[PDB]
Amino acid sequence: MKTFRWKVKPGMDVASVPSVRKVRFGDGYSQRAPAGLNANLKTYSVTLSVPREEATVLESFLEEHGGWKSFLWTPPYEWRQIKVTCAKWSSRVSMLRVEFSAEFEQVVN
Amino acid sequence: MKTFRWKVKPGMDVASVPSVRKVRFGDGYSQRAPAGLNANLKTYSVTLSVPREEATVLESFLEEHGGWKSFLWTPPYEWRQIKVTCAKWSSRVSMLRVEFSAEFEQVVN
Amino acid sequence: MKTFRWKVKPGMDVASVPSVRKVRFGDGYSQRAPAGLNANLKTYSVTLSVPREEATVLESFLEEHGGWKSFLWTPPYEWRQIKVTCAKWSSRVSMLRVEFSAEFEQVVN
Amino acid sequence: MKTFRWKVKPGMDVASVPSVRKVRFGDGYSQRAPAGLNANLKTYSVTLSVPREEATVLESFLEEHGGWKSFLWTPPYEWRQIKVTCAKWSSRVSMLRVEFSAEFEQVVN
Amino acid sequence: MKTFRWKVKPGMDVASVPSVRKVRFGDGYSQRAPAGLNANLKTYSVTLSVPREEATVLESFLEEHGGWKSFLWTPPYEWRQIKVTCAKWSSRVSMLRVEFSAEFEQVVN
Amino acid sequence: MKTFRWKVKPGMDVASVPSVRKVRFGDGYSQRAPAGLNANLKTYSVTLSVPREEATVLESFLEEHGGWKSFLWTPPYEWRQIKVTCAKWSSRVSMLRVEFSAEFEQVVN
Amino acid sequence: QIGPAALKAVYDMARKGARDEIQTQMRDGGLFS
Amino acid sequence: QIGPAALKAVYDMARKGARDEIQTQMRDGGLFS
Amino acid sequence: QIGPAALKAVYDMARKGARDEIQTQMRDGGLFS
Amino acid sequence: AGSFFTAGATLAAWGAAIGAGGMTGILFSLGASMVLGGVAQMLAPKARTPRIQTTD
Numbered sequence: 001m002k003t004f005r006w007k008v009k010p011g012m013d014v015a016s017v018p019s020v021r022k023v024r025f026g027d028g029y030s031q032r033a034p035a036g037l038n039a040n041l042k043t044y045s046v047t048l049s050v051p052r053e054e055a056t057v058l059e060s061f062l063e064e065h066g067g068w069k070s071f072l073w074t075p076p077y078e079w080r081q082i083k084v085t086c087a088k089w090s091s092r093v094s095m096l097r098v099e100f101s102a103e104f105e106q107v108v109n
Numbered sequence: 110m111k112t113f114r115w116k117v118k119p120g121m122d123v124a125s126v127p128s129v130r131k132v133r134f135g136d137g138y139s140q141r142a143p144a145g146l147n148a149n150l151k152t153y154s155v156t157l158s159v160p161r162e163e164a165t166v167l168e169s170f171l172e173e174h175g176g177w178k179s180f181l182w183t184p185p186y187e188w189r190q191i192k193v194t195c196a197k198w199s200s201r202v203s204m205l206r207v208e209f210s211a212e213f214e215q216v217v218n
Numbered sequence: 219m220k221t222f223r224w225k226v227k228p229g230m231d232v233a234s235v236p237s238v239r240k241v242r243f244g245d246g247y248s249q250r251a252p253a254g255l256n257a258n259l260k261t262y263s264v265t266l267s268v269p270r271e272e273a274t275v276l277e278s279f280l281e282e283h284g285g286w287k288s289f290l291w292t293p294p295y296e297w298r299q300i301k302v303t304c305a306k307w308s309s310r311v312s313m314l315r316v317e318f319s320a321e322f323e324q325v326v327n
Numbered sequence: 328m329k330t331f332r333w334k335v336k337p338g339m340d341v342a343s344v345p346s347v348r349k350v351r352f353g354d355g356y357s358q359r360a361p362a363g364l365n366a367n368l369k370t371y372s373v374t375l376s377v378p379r380e381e382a383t384v385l386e387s388f389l390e391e392h393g394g395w396k397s398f399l400w401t402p403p404y405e406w407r408q409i410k411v412t413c414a415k416w417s418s419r420v421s422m423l424r425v426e427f428s429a430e431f432e433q434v435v436n
Numbered sequence: 437m438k439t440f441r442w443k444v445k446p447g448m449d450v451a452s453v454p455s456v457r458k459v460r461f462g463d464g465y466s467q468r469a470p471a472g473l474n475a476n477l478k479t480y481s482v483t484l485s486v487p488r489e490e491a492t493v494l495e496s497f498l499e500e501h502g503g504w505k506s507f508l509w510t511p512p513y514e515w516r517q518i519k520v521t522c523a524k525w526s527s528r529v530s531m532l533r534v535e536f537s538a539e540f541e542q543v544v545n
Numbered sequence: 546m547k548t549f550r551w552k553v554k555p556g557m558d559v560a561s562v563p564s565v566r567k568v569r570f571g572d573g574y575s576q577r578a579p580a581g582l583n584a585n586l587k588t589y590s591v592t593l594s595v596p597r598e599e600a601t602v603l604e605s606f607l608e609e610h611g612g613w614k615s616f617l618w619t620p621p622y623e624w625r626q627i628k629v630t631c632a633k634w635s636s637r638v639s640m641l642r643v644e645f646s647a648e649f650e651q652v653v654n
Numbered sequence: 655q656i657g658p659a660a661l662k663a664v665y666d667m668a669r670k671g672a673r674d675e676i677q678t679q680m681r682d683g684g685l686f687s
Numbered sequence: 688q689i690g691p692a693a694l695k696a697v698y699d700m701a702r703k704g705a706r707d708e709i710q711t712q713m714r715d716g717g718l719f720s
Numbered sequence: 721q722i723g724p725a726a727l728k729a730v731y732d733m734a735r736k737g738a739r740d741e742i743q744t745q746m747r748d749g750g751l752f753s
Numbered sequence: 754a755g756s757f758f759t760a761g762a763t764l765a766a767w768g769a770a771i772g773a774g775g776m777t778g779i780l781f782s783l784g785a786s787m788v789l790g791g792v793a794q795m796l797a798p799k800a801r802t803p804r805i806q807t808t809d
Contacts, residue, residue, distance in 0.1 A: 011421040016386075017414065019136045020394035021775055028365020028435040032395035032412070035775065036136050040393065056187050059125075066148045067129035068141035077420050078383050085141070091123045093186055109139065135774055147246020165296055168234075175258065176238035177250035194250070196235065202295050203229040217246040237463045254463050274514055277452075284475045285456035286468035303468070309450040311513055325466065341636045347612035352757055354564045354581050357654065359613035359630070366611045404638055405601050474573020492623055495561075502585065503565035504577035521577070523563070529622050530556040544573040655688070655721070664697055664730055668704025671734030672741075675705075676712065676720060679742065679753075687709075687720050687742060687753050688721070690768030695756035697730055701737025709741065709751060720742075720753050725772045732779040743789055 001061055004073040004084075006048050013045035014077055041106045044075055044084070048100040055091065055098035062089045062102070070107050082106050110170060113182040113193070113213075115157055122154040123186055150215045153184055153193070157209040164200065164207040171198045171211065179216045191215045219279060222291040222302075224266050231263035232295055259324045262293060262302070266318040273309065273316035280307045280320070288325050300324050331400040331411070333375055333385060340372040341404055368433040371402055371411070375427040382418065382425040389416045389429065397434045409433050440509040440520070442484055442494060449481040450513055477542050480511055480520070484536040491527065491534040498525045498538065506543045518542045546606060549618040549629075551593050558590035559622055586651040589620060589629070593645040600636065600643035607634045607647070615652050627651050 018040035021033040050058055065071060070083040089102040127149035133139035159167055174180055179192045198211035236258035239251040268276055283289060288301040307320040345367035351357035377385055392398055397410040416429035454476035460466035486494055501507055506519045525538035563585040566578040595603055610616060615628040634647040679687040712720040745753040772778045787795055 011419050014418045014420065016390065016416055018390075018394040019775065020414070022394075027363040028368065030434060030436055032397075034393055034395050039390070040136075059187070063125065063127070063149060066143055067127040068143055077418075077425075078386070087129070088124070088126045090125070091186075093119070093121045093123065095119045098186075107139065109141075145245040150246065168296070172234065172236075172257070175252055176236040177240075177252050179250075196238070198234055200232045200295075201229050202232065216248060218248055259463075277514070281452070281454070281476060284470060285454040286470055305456070306451070306453050308452070309513075311446070311448050311450065313446045316513075327466065327468075337638070337640045339638045341638065342633070343608070343635070344633050345608070345612040347632070349613075349761065354586075357652065359654075361611055361613055367608060404643075405604070472572040477573065495559075495623070499561065499563070499585065502579055503563040503567075504579055506577075523565070525561055527559045527622075528556050529559065534622075543575060545575055661700070664700045665704050667727065667730050668701040668734040668737065669708050671701065671731055672705040672708035672738040675735050675738035675742065676708065676718060680718070685742060685746075685753070687718070689760075690764040691756055691759035691762075694733070694759050694764070697733045698737050701734040702741050704734065705738040705741035708738075709745065709753060713751070720745075720751065721771045729772065729779050732781070736779070736781050739786070743786070 001064065002072050004061070004071050006050065006058060008046045008076060009049055010047055012047070012075075012077075014042060014075075015045070016040055016042050038108065041108070043106065044077075044104045046102050046104050048102075050098055050100065052093075052096055052098055055093075055100070058100060059089075059091070062086055070109055073104065083109065110173075111180050113170070113180055115159070115167060117185065118156045118158055121156065121186075123184075124152045124154075125149045147217055150217070152215075153186070153213040155209075155211045155213050157211070158206055159209065161202065161205065161207055164202070164209075167209060168198075168200070171195055179218070182213060184213075192217070219282065220290050222279070222289050224268065224276060226264050226294060227267055228265060230265065230295075232260060232293075233263070234258050234260050256326065259326070261324065262295075262322045264320050264322050266320075268316050268318065270311070270314055270316055273311075273318075276318060277307075277309070280304055288327055291322065301327065328388060328391070329398050331388070331398055333377070335403065336374045336376055339374060339404075341402075342370045342372075343367045365435050368435070370433070371404070371431040373427075373429045373431050375429070376424055377427065379420065379423065379425055382420065382427075385427060386416075386418070389413055397436075400431060402431075410435070437497065437500075438507050440497070440507055442486070444512065445483045445485055448483060448513075450511075451479045451481075452476045474544055477544070479542075480513070480540040482536075482538045482540050484538070485533055486536065488529065488532065488534055491529065491536075494536060495525075495527065498522055498536075506545075509540060511540075519544070546609060547617050549606070549616050551595065551603060553591045553621060554594055555592055557592070557620075557622075559587055559620075560590070561585050561587050583653065586653070588651065589622075589649045591647050591649050593647070595643050595645065597638075597641060597643055600638075600645075603645060604634075604636070607631055615654060618649065620649075628654065 019035045021035040023031040025031065048058065061071075065085065067087045068085065070085050072081055073084050074081045083106065084104040085107050086102050086104050089100055091098055091100045128144045129148075130142035130144045131139070132141075157167065174195070176194070176196050179194045181190055182193045183190045193213040193215045195211045195213055198209060200210070201208045237253045239253040241249040243249065266276065279289075283303065285305045286303065288303050290299055291302045292299045301324065302322040303325050304320050304322050307318055309319075310317045346362045347366070348360040348362045349357070350359075375385070392413070394412070394414050397412045399408055400411045401408045411431040411433050413429045413431055416427060418428070419426045455471045456475070457469035457471045458466070459468075484494065501522070503521070503523050506521045508517055509520045510517045520540040520542045522538050522540055525536060527537070528535045564580045566580040568576040570576065593603065606616075610630070612632045613630065615630050617626055618629050619626045629649040629651050631647050631649050634645060636643055636645045676687040679685040709720045712718045742753040745751045767778065790799070793799075
């Protein structure tokens with residue numbers, strides 16, 4: 001499957017941390033370069049809350065890709081669809097609901 | 110005995126973190142492969158609450174297996190019988206009840 | 219002196235963590251063995267509370283063995299007398315009572 | 328665009344830790360030298376709170392510079408225009424507002 | 437001057453951790469020996485609360501010994517005079533009183 | 546500029562940590578020496594609170610010395626003027642005031 | 655990281671590095687170890 | 688673990704490993720270092 | 721610390737120690753490496 | 754030669770970040786290592802001679 005349809009409730013963490021090449025000269029001077037050619041990828045600390053019956057579907061969707069493989073997702077941050085991969089997706093079970101915590105990493109591929 | 114027939118408390122964590130082959134030098138082009146065939150075997154952080162009298166039976170069951178000798182178990186998460194292995198199963202012995210904290214990692218063989 | 223007579227109030231930690239020989243093959247298969255020959259020894263996180271006049275007797279008893287040597291103790295967990303050794307026994311003094319926190323390790327010897 | 332024109336929240340940390348040359352063997356005689364010419368360039372742990380609509384603009388500003396390409400900024404601390412560089416600028420996207428946690432390190436070139 | 441004559445606050449810790457010779461390969465047979473002759477020399481985490489005027493006297497007493505030069509002390513724990521050494525004795529100077537946090541490790545020589 | 550005029554509110558931490566040469570012999574015996582020749586220097590964990598206008602003056606004073614160099618200060622602990630150096634002086638800005646945290650290290654020089 | 659287990663790893667990595675350096679010195683310029 | 692103190696320990700362990708490897712290579716097969 | 725970079729740094733430190741020990745053994749007594 | 758100046762720079766900021774993928778540590782300046790045989794060895798390869806034979 002290609003698209004992620006579930007929704008993220010609480011307020012995620014969107015980390016950029018671009019990679020740069022930095023050289024530190026002597027008395028206060030330096031030299032900086034963007035290191036790479038195509039921007040930075042940016043990662044989302046996402047958390048879902050789902051009914052106990054729908055947690056199986058979410059697990060199947062997250063396990064089919066299995067760490068590798070990318071799926072489409074429109075983050076509720078910039079509203080631009082991107083390709084992401086998930087690699088951990090911890091999940092905590094409760095009496096009537098299941099809370100998923102995951103880290104979605106944007107990928108060019 | 111070959112089946113875990115006790116009941117687990119509401120709060121239970123299920124971690125997946127599948128195994129993939131990642132190749133990426135620096136922050137350039139990246140390649141991902143599914144690695145093995147049995148990608149993710151998950152992990153359940155199981156907690157139990159049992160009267161002081163049945164703690165002996167629970168520890169006898171968990172101790173006879175002794176880290177090896179996987180046993181059958183049906184998690185309340187996907188309701189599918191699997192084979193799991195436990196290795197820590199710490200315990201707290203309160204005045205009237207005892208709390209078991211164990212880790213069930215599912216296996217194949 | 220051979221037997222431990224004092225009593226543990228709050229609910230202790232009874233850690234098993236058996237030692238096993240585990241080999242992980244490729245696509246999800248593995249190989250497990252019990253490593254040793256005689257079970258796992260199991261350790262108790264014991265904590266006493268005693269009147270300020272009896273703390274001297276408890277410390278004398280715990281210092282006579284002095285890390286090495288074993289004493290008999292019947293844990294309020296399985297009610298089977300075992301041989302244990304204590305090696306830390308931290309103690310905190312107060313106005314009228316002294317609280318001991320110790321780790322009893324079961325030994326075959 | 329070469330000027331950060333947004334407003335920062337009350338609680339902002341300013342760390343200095345200047346760079347000096349220190350010679351001291353053991354706890355004997357000590358000698359200290361000012362090392363370089365631009366001794367301390369400080370560091371501001373800036374935090375912002377902005378409506379969800381302007382988060383895209385703020386991240387576009389921070390993304391275009393992308394670690395390199397220092398920009399002009401007037402901290403509310405000494406009210407003197409300086410040149411700063413940001414490298415992390417994490418964000419958290421609540422229901423109605425988004426908070427930015429960025430680190431501005433002042434430069435010379 | 438050779439006798440710490442101040443009073444310590446109620447809650448103080450007494451750690452023992454005696455020194456023994458342990459031989460155990462893996463989880464097989466284990467052998468324990470008493471090692472030295474003065475097995476356990478304990479450690480008291482002493483805390484004091486003194487008016488700002490006598491803080492100078494207490495600090496002068498602790499500083500004159502200066503790590504070496506053990507002094508006589510009768511802990512309120514076993515009421516037996518021993519010889520102890522202090523090495524850190526941090527202090528905190530409140531509006532009207534000052535607290536001392538010192539560590540007393542007892543010696544033989 | 547030579548003297549530090551601002552005042553410390555909360556109750557600092559005055560850490561001594563003398564340096565000693567210690568040899569531990571066998572059955573409980575040892576050998577201790579003062580290692581150095583001139584006492585221990587002691588360090589103060591100082592915090593200032595200042596109005597938002599005087600924070601610039603305090604920063605200028607602490608930046609002129611710039612990690613190296615020493616200034617005179619009479620601590621509110623022993624009321625004996627000493628020579629100290631400051632090397633970090635973190636500062637947190639607020640709506641109407643600025644809170645400085647710093648570590649003043651006494652120096653013979 | 656617990657010291658007792660890390661010391662063996664450091665020692666064995668040192669052994670591997672020493673063997674690699676020895677084999678490198680047996681090349682043309684080198685030092686012939 | 689503070690780096691400045693650990694680097695000297697790693698260097699000394701490396702020296703010991705190099706000496707041990709050299710003495711090992713002076714055996715029969717080896718490389719004669 | 722993270723294992724990868726630490727292992728690499730240990731490897732380079734071991735190489736440096738091995739080179740220093742080799743150059744030391746080429747002195748008078750030594751082993752002539 | 755002794756951890757006297759490893760703590761001279763205190764290595765604190767680098768050690769807390771173990772390094773980076775962008776930059777490498779343990780550079781190990783080759784100053785004294787390249788000069789062990791002599792300065793004339795850094796410029797010329799020090800032509801060799803045959804082993805002295807007792808037959809001669």
